[PDB]
Amino acid sequence: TTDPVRMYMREMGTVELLTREGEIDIAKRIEDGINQVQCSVAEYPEAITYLLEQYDRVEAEEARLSDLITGFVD
Amino acid sequence: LKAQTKTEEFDAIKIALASPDMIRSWSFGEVKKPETINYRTFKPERDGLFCARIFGPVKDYECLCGKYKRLKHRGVICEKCGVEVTQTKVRRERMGHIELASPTAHIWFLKSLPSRIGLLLDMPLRDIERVLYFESYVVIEGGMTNLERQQILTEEQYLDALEEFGDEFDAKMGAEAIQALLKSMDLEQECEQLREELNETNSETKRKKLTKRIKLLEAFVQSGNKPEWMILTVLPVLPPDLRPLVPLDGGRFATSDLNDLYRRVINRNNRLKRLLDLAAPDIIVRNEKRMLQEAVDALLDNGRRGRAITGSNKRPLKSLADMIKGKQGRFRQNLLGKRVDYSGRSVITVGPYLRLHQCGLPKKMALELFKPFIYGKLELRGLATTIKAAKKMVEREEAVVWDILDEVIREHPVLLNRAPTLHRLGIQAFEPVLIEGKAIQLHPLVCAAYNADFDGDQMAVHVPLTLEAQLEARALMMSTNNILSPANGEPIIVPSQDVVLGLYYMTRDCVNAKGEGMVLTGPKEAERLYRSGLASLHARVKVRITEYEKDANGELVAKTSLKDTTVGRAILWMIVPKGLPYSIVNQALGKKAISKMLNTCYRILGLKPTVIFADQIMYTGFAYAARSGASVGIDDMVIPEKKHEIISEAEAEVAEIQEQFQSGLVTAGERYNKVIDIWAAANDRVSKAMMDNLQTETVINRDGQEEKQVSFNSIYMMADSGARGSAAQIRQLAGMRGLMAKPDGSIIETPITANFREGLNVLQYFISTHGARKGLADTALKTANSGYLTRRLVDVAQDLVVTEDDCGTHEGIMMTPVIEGGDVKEPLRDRVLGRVTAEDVLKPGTADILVPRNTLLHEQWCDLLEENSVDAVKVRSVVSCDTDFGVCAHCYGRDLARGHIINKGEAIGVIAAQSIGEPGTQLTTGGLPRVADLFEARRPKEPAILAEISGIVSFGKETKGKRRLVITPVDGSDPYEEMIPKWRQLNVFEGERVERGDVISDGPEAPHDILRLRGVHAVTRYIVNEVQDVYRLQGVKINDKHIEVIVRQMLRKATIVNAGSSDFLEGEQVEYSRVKIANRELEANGKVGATYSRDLLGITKASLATESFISAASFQETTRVLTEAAVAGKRDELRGLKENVIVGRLIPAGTGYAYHQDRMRRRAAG
Amino acid sequence: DKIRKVLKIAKEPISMETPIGDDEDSHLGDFIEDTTLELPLDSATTESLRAATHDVLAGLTAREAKVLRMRFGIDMNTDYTLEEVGKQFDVTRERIRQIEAKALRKLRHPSRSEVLRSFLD
Amino acid sequence: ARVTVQDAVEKIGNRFDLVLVAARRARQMQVGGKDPLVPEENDKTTVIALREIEEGLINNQILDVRERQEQQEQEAAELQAVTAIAEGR
Amino acid sequence: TPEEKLLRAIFGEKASDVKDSSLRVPNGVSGTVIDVQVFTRDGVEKDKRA
Amino acid sequence: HARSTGSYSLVTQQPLGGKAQFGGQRFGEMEVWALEAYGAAYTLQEMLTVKSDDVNGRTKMYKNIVDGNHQMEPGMPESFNVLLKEIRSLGINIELEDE
């Protein structure tokens, strides 16, 4: 009917509400996905040496710890 | 040589679709942020709708940051925040742009009633919209698979359809789809297919739509427009000062609605950009895209979707389409219509002292009006050191300034204007005369042309600044230069009420009066007798007079005699110039004769003598009327002595018919009608009773017993002279007044038996109220109704101007007296006067040429035609004129405020329409709408039917709802048979031969028929005789020329039949068409020429088609005109009136007609 | 006291398209006059004040006109500090300043003064 | 004053060209290029030009004749100047 | 401007930091002042006349 | 009321009364026809250009009225100049052609 409120309201109404169990399913899939790329990044040599070149610049007072890492586990 | 690159005097204008690269050309920056102003320092936030960087400095020649504040640094872009320091004017000019995230549809080309994207793609609108909102997928460049190019699919259908064929099939949705469709479209190819399809199938339904589409397409192709551009990539932003944020008092701010709108479009757009880098789900980016689509629509044209409302304010915010648009068409030139400097206005008073060429101008108005003139003259003569000191002198009203003002005034006309400007005489130039007091004084003689009373009407003054305007004001619009109405050549300067009562009292005679019988040497000692108290003003007297007749060849003859006349007439003869005979003043001199006096004076001695004469008549009229002591007392209105008896006798009749209705001898209706008539007869009886008693009753004695003359009673003199009052109105004062009418339209069968000299009682008065109340409304609505008519009229003519000199067509219309049923409802001399003969006219015998071929017919020639018995003269009209794009003066006629034949370039269209419109206030099927019905071509409800073709006719087939009529021509093929509903009573004789155009039934006939069957000259005559009936029944004089020029525009268009250049059925200009088949008849093709058929368009329909699109955007619906031209890329060449005014140049008529001509030839010329 | 200041910027701007009066196409925006323009009865007196000072400047010595046109921005980019003028003219500092005085002095005692005095009201 | 221009319209037919020509002429007097051809009654350049038309000593031809002449009168002054622009070569 | 600035040097006038907003009698209307009222914001010190 | 040169409106530069010295008189469509019916072209141009809508011509004119040269160098009324930006702010490319 145009009036975009309606063609929105009607477009989302198709998507089914998640079951309380379905919520955890999707979140688990997310973890795997990111974790695939996290491990995939760890396997790149340039990814390490680059991290090295960034911290060697931090200790020389050419940068700050806040512009490189957000902290580790801990 | 080199043509140019920088600024010249531009000609024409072009309108077209805008490329993204083209929009970017205008843009001085991308407005990237909804921010307006800083909120503390009220400075513009940078990269926002108001940005000094993008648009321009807030203040003159000053950088925003303030680093370069000096008027010296100018083209410098500040290194800190880029602002080139320049006048703030550039904030009114520089545009901007916005690069849109998703493509967007242009509401104008999507939603204008003939959807441009829709018929350019031959795709339904609802489908295109379903694609824009993501409600279905549409195919593009479908290839060979399963699917049509424009076919539409659903989610599941697209998926199933996608699984089968991965490639060689393509489908999209949203704006990108429509844009892909338009870009992919090959226009050339569609025409070929469309041309073939046109030829194969013959059906009106089919090829009607076909021709519409093909016209747009080949138009769009030749246009230069690329279809893709109807979908917006880049969105221009309007310069800030055209939607300013300016502050107000008390510190509140106020700004244009575009800002609330523009901001939204920016925001949604910006969020959408963001939602892509956040990779939002489909359901969202679609919704943001839909939302962006809505905002662009509200910005551009609001009201075509949801009608967005302004922030915190209920009223829907006004959009860009609404800024151009309005009621009606454009706000700029439309009534009304721009305020103008060097003007004023005030209440007006009399000023009988004025000569006919001048006016009383308040001292103070003139000081403020001519202020720059006064300043420069003050320091031109050195009375003021500098312009500032000059300001202080006149601001002080120093005594010396008044004399300088008389200098700047002396030869310097001013324009006077009244409120409902109807004909061109609504503005007239006068020479100003300095007057103490706050009132404008207006020459009485002009008060008539303006329709200006002294009951407080106010008038406006305008100063003609430029030299060309002073000589225009003096030589065109000047009072003395227009003394004659352009509607009919009769003088509009006619003496008015008081003045004509004076001359009536002056030339008049009673039976016995002082000096009766004596004789005097000349008018001089007649006045010496009167002023000295010896002789009465009116007494029968012989006096020696010397009259003149110019009957030589341009030479004044003299003849002197003893004329038997009165004292008053002898004195008045003193005013009459030269070659007029004494005969003109020897009559009783009423208002009618007193106008024909002026008329003849104009047609014999010319302009100058008529002017100085006209003045004189006024002065003398007022003066002698003042001596006369005419008044109106209550004993001046005389009721007949037999009145009580007439009412009583007529009242018996009513009680008789009543006895017949109670006894059933007569029906209720038959009774009612009877009573209404007997009462009616009584009104006539009483009225023609008081009129006889009132009229002649001065009954006096000379040396003998008795004699009786026309009464000298005051109120009678008023009505006989023509000053004021009329037999109808006098009748209401003394005799009974009328039978009023109840609101529903019935007429009360109990008239008002009393009058105003007597009392009207509660009932009589209460009943009179309805007539008064309806009276006022009718004039007030019919005043407005008339104006609408003149509007439609000047629109259909306007650009019509005398262009050629003599077109040289022998063609013309036959002029006969109107001769309706009685004797001669209008003579021949008036119909033929001032026209030009189509061919030489004979005496009753021949090899005798009275009038030779085309000769202007003036008064001597018309008397020469009247001398001979000549009853019919063929005359050239503007309706038959062969000149294309105008009227040749020779075909027009002479008429003007001047007697000469119309000059080259005068705009007749305006003066035709205005002349038809101005009297329309005075009108009353029939009435003023009947006139509108005529000019609108409207076909009556139950029209008659005319024989389609000559030959013997008969009836065929049977009663289906139509009983067929079969015509059988002698030589030719029979096949014409028309289906006529048989429940309408016929006329055409079943056994008789009927000529084409005969009456096959009765009832009115559509002028469409008359043009088609009977021909052009015939139909033009029908209109003129019909509209002229309405006006003439009311006493309105309008020369047929004006009705004819309007008519010419009515038939301006025609519909082609044959072919060989342009399309079959196209409706088009006989100007264009006639130029194309006349060019082909020679040169070109040996003869390939196409035949047309002339069409009759109502005035309002014909004005719709206008070559100039700027003209159409004024009075038509602005949105539609602009789209339809921008698609076709129409190039407006100016050349018309309306458009040149819009753009602000010399009208291509009148003084300007010389200019445009001089340029037009430079154009399309080496 | 910030209530007033704060309360003011807090108000929403008024639609300039607000119809006012007569129901006529008169809208709020039609009445907001241009204050940034310069009225012609003024611009003319400016074009006049130029001709005035140019007249009174041909009345001075050729060096006084150059030094005074220099010391003010008259018909030149910017204007020059009295030292800057000293470098172009070669006799510097106090020398130039005196000339300035007499120039203003010659335009001061009315013959010169009668025309230019009328610009200040 | 000039009450009616009727006399002027006779000399030049058009009656619009009267406004144009009398204007062009009226400027020859107002911007000081010329002086009147007939006694000035204090009539402003508007009316003086019209009196000049009435007397038949001014119309589009005469003006065009005078101007084409002044071109050579000025072309007579500048002769030795512009030829001196032989540095062209 | 330059020429206005020279003007001030000759006639030695100090051009104020204030613009003239005074209410002055409408042009041409002339009468007698029969009253004056002074309303002041609550919190601003009332002036002499007020 | 009478006005020589008054104040002017911001949105469109047109005569407007701000001092209660009233803005000039309103010249209408019908009043325009009246000038077109007479042959007066220059009176009409000066009415709808220099006397009103032309931000330049008014001042260029005023200096000439005192200078003693009655002329007008009309230029283009600001009304149409605005219509141009407004059409062009839409998707419509409107240009002034030729020479």
Ligand SMILES: [Mg+2]
């Ligand atoms: Mg009245």
Ligand SMILES: [Zn+2]
């Ligand atoms: Zn800066």
Ligand SMILES: [Zn+2]
């Ligand atoms: Zn013709």
